């Protein structure tokens, strides 16, 4: 009774890979499938050792290890389109390392992933990332503001938004995040009432709020 015979009728739904530690790794595509497999192993239908894995869990695990041994490495995401040969995207600007160091890093990653034959490291451009983000928000016609910091870019989408706008935004952001991850660019989406709650005011360095006719309030520059 092979393991593939136990996972189901839809043979193409799962992928079995042998690992150097003498263990079978069942790669899955989503949570629902992950739990469909884990139930089979946890029930004990199979009798040797086996494990279930997916891209999100592995990205978390590897990030946690990097936090300890390479606490200043600037990177984006690890892609597992080909689970036998992952691709790791590093920033070209914000990292200074030699070719030798990169090779060492590669070998240590290979030690963390006993199902992978090698890890390919690719250098990506920050300007490219930022440009795709701003082009996406323009193409979708959302109102936004951009803030720049040394380590990152932030886009603030806030105010009174219509249903159509909210839907477009959610779809786009979900698409972007799956490519670039959430380390360099952050999108803040916040529904605001009217800033001042239907009250007249004067803006600028001498601004003030009219609480009511005959009643002035001086909170701040506006």
């Amino acid at each position: 009774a092979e393991l593939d015979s136990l996972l189901g009728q839809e043979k193409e739904r799962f992928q079995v890979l042998p690992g150097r530690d003498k263990m079978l790794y069942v790669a899955a595509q989503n949570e629902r499938d992950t739990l469909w497999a884990r139930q089979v192993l946890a029930r004990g239908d199979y009798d040797k050792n086996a494990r279930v894995i997916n891209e999100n869990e592995e990205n978390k695990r590897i990030s946690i290890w990097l936090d300890t041994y390479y606490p200043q490495l600037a990177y984006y995401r690890i892609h597992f389109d080909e689970p036998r040969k992952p691709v790791f995207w590093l920033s070209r600007q914000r990292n200074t390392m030699s070719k030798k160091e990169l090779e060492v890093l590669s070998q240590k990653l290979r030690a963390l992933m006993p199902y992978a034959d090698s890890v390919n490291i690719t250098l990506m451009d920050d300007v490219t990332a930022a440009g795709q983000a701003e082009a996406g928000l323009k193409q979708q016609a959302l109102p936004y503001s951009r803030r720049n910091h040394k380590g990152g870019v932030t886009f603030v989408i806030q105010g009174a938004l219509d249903d159509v706008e909210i839907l477009r935004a959610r779809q786009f952001v979900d698409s972007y995040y799956r490519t670039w991850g959430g380390r360099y660019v952050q999108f803040a989406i916040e529904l605001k009432d009217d800033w001042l709650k239907g009250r007249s005011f004067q803006y600028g360095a001498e601004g003030y709020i009219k609480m009511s006719p005959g009643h002035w309030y001086f909170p701040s520059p506006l």
């Binding site: 009250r199 009219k210 006719p213």
Partner: peptide
């Protein structure tokens, strides 16, 4: 209103509007 200085009226009586204009 990122720049300068102005007034955001909400069905305000002209007395309160031109009073706000008085400083300029």
């Amino acid at each position: 209103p990122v720049t300068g200085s102005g007034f955001v009226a909400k069905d305000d009586s002209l007395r309160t509007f031109f009073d706000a204009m008085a400083l300029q």
